Amino acid sequence: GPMSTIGATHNVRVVGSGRKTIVLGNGYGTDQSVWRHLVPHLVGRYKVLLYDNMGAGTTNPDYYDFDRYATLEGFAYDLLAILEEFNVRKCIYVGHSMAAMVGMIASIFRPDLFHKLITISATPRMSNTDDYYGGFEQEELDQMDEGLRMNHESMIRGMAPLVVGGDMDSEAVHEYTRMLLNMRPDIALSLSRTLYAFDMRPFLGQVTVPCHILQSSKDMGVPVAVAEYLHQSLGGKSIVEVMSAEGHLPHLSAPEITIPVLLRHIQQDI
Amino acid sequence: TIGATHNVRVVGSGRKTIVLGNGYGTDQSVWRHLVPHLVGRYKVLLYDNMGAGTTNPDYYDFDRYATLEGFAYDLLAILEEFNVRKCIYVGHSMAAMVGMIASIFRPDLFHKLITISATPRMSNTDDYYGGFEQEELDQMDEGLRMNHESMIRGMAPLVVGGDMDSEAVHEYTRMLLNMRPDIALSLSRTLYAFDMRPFLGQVTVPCHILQSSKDMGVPVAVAEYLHQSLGGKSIVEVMSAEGHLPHLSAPEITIPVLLRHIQQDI
């Protein structure tokens, strides 16, 4: 009855101390160590909750429920369950990419739990349509999927430097490559396919909590125009900041620039 | 993989490394008020003992963990895997006894031990006060066995003590309720019959013995017994904080005491 395994299965960690709580959600294929340059600057004034989304290399693959996670709201249910279990009444939610969209969905189901959302490299939809520019044609996504299934390790070793950007053999490229490779390949494929088909656009007007939209000046997964799209479509308050840093994972690869941006948007309200 | 199994996390920087060991049924978030005061000066290693609600119960090896001896192996294995030569070790309750067991094999690894709510034997004998008669430990065992969740919901606020209906009481209740009941029963019975006394004399590493007032599990006399019995240097500080988990429930008192003893050796 009262026994919850969600803290063990999702590697939930509460650190820091303070009146307000910050929750950090990881993007595709990453684990919470991606936040290790941010957390030191939060713990003096904030409680911080870290966790890994189901299917990460740091999590047990036997617990990945394919039907649950076939579409993204399954991860939103996990987030709400973590907030319930750890008695998080209200939080500042920072989410990278996938986790930005998960926090959006969760904030629609339960706006009371979210003081605001802060997004990094968020896109509501990857593939272009006749009236929307996501940065990918569907044929590109299909070819990317074909490369991933045909030779999973080679695809990952090659894509990780391009996604991180600005210099392979950077430490961040190595960590990202390692987290991607530590995923079980069938889970990596399934979640990739979920993200290829995800479409937040119809739902964006339902978001009412304030959103701080941050993104890099050059992100191979997210054209900067998509950040402006979100700003025009969200149902509540929002602000966009394009950072000088490049890359899909700037909190990992450009913390010297990104952490100060993040802190500014944590403190200040729109 | 022992790093992943025990949720080992390393943070901070400096010549000293501080290792924090958690008490029964408790995970490393109990140290969350202390760690931000440490990382500007020290490297800090946090981990969870097997059986904690944050660990996978499938990996609780009952034969391995049948005596407190089994948790020191884990500690040393963790200390080796993360390349920690010499640590300052802060252990709460059972972890104080573990770091002490572990210091007996390996003095070289511990610059000193700091203990919170440490006790070498819970049950009274004729020449010793531990705070509990054997019948009391018997009733507590039977209470856990007969209704796990009811036992915990009642005992957790008692054990935390101090201020009532606190954030600390909720977290302690939550972590105890997340243990698998057979593990909780197993580990509790070990702690109920454990006896460290014949080994204290071989504890030669210096030990800072910090004791809350009004700790339902450790009378104040036990801190003085440990002070008398350890083989090396020791000092006792009785704290004004109340309760069994003052690092969790009274950090505003306990953290400055901890910082003082981390920095001042004697």
Author numbering:
A (entry chain A): -1 to 268
B (entry chain B): 3 to 268
What is written in the article reporting this PDB entry?
To obtain additional insight into the strigolactone perception in Castilleja, we solved the crystal structure of KAI2d15 at a resolution of 1.8 Å. As expected, the protein adopted a canonical α/β hydrolase architecture, with a 4-helix lid domain covering the substrate binding pocket containing a Ser/His/Asp catalytic triad at its base. The substrate binding pocket was quite voluminous, measuring 908 Å3, which surpassed the 861 Å3 found in the strigolactone receptor KAI2d4 from Orobanche minor, but was smaller than the 1111 Å3 detected in the highly sensitive SL receptor HTL7 from Striga hermonthica. We found 3 methionine residues in the crystal structure of KAI2d15 that surround the entrance to the protein’s substrate binding pocket, including an alternative side-chain conformation of M142. To study the effect of these methionine residues on the receptor’s substrate specificity and sensitivity, we created a protein variant, replacing the three methionines with valines (KAI2d15 M142V M153V M157V). The mutant protein showed destabilization at lower ligand concentrations when GR24 or 5-deoxystrigol were present, while the wild-type protein destabilized at lower concentrations of strigol or orobanchol. We specifically compared Michaelis-Menten parameters between the KAI2d15 wild type and the mutant, in which three of the methionines at the substrate pocket entrance had been replaced with valines (KAI2d15 M142V M153V M157V). While the turnover numbers (kcat) of these proteins showed no significant difference, we found a 3-fold decrease in the Michaelis constant (KM) for wild-type KAI2d15 as compared to the mutant version (0.8 μM in wild-type KAI2 vs. 2.4 μM in KAI2d15 M142V M153V M157V). We observed a linear trade-off between these two catalytic parameters in all investigated KAI2 proteins, except KAI2d15, and remarkably, the trade-off was restored in the KAI2d15 M142V M153V M157V mutant. Thus, a possible dual role of the methionines in both enhancing substrate binding and promoting product release might be the molecular basis for KAI2d15 mitigating the typical trade-off observed in enzyme kinetics.
Many parasitic Orobanchaceae have evolved a large clade of diversified KAI2 proteins (KAI2d) as receptors for exogenous strigolactones. We present the genome of Castilleja foliolosa, which reveals an abundance of KAI2d paralogs that act as strigolactone receptors. Castilleja foliolosa’s KAI2d proteins include high-turnover enzymes, in particular KAI2d15, which features a substrate binding pocket with a methionine cluster at its entrance that is involved in the trade-off between substrate turnover and affinity. In summary, our research reveals that Castilleja possesses a large clade of KAI2d proteins, acting as strigolactone receptors, participating in activating a parasitic state in the plant.
